[PDB]
C-alpha cells in the first residue's frame, strides 16, 4: 500500500501471509477534550521496507 502511515511507520510485506484483526476502540483509546498521546510519523526520507 502507498501513502504516509503505511509508507513511513508500518509497511506490510507484499507477500504477506496470515490474518489481520480489526475492531473499533473509541472508549479505550479516546477521551474528552483531546487524546493525542499516540504519534504517527508522516515525515520520512523515503518509503519504508
Amino acid at each position: 500500500q502507498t501513502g504516509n502511515i503505511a509508507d513511513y511507520n508500518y509497511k506490510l510485506p507484499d507477500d504477506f501471509t496470515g490474518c489481520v484483526i480489526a475492531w473499533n476502540s473509541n472508549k479505550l483509546d479516546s477521551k474528552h477534550s483531546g487524546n493525542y498521546d499516540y504519534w504517527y510519523r508522516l515525515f520520512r526520507k523515503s518509503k519504508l521496507k
Partner: protein
Amino acid sequence: YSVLYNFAPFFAFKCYGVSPTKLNDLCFTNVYADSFVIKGNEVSQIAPG
C-alpha cells in the same frame, strides 16, 4: 511552491493534513485559498479544533 517557500518570511508554516515537503509532485484540481490579515497571536490561534 518556491514562492510559498522562499518568498516572504512565512512566519506560519504549520499544517497537519498533508506534508508540505512531499507536495511538489502531489497534484490536485481545486484549492480553497482564503486571505485575511490578523495580529501575531491570532496566527498561532489559527488551528483545527
